[PDB]
């Protein structure tokens, strides 16, 4: 899984199965961490119109 | 390619109301069933 984002922690009750969350966009929205099974959300870095 | 789910709950001939179960196994094994059992 690719991307570019803000990485943290996070509070997601991920359910000892569940490897990444999604948002209504099919976007990843938080993911495990592979070596170490915390839970990270994915926030894309910040931006706006100038 | 065959998965397991389960849910356990205490109780008050199946009940009624909401249950959704969670995966406890994906087996990786390919066989054909057709047919079933259970042990006692
Ligand atoms: C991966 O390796 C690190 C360092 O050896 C260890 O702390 C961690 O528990 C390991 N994780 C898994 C999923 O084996
Ligand atoms: C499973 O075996 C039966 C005969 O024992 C056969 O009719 C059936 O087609 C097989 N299943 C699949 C997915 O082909």
């Keep these: 899984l690719t991307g570019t984002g803000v990485l943290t922690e996070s509070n997601k009750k991920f ?7 999604r948002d209504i966009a099919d976007t990843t929205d938080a993911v495990r961490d592979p070596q170490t099974l915390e839970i990270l959300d994915i926030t894309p870095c910040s931006f706006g119109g100038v | 390619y065959f998965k397991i789910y389960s849910k356990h709950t205490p109780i008050n001939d199946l009940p009624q109301g909401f249950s959704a179960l969670e995966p406890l196994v994906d087996l ?12 006692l």
Excluded: S
């Design chain 1, 15 to 21: 359910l000892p199965f569940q490897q990444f969350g």
């Design chain 2, 28 to 39: 990786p094994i390919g066989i054909n069933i057709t047919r079933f059992q259970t042990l």
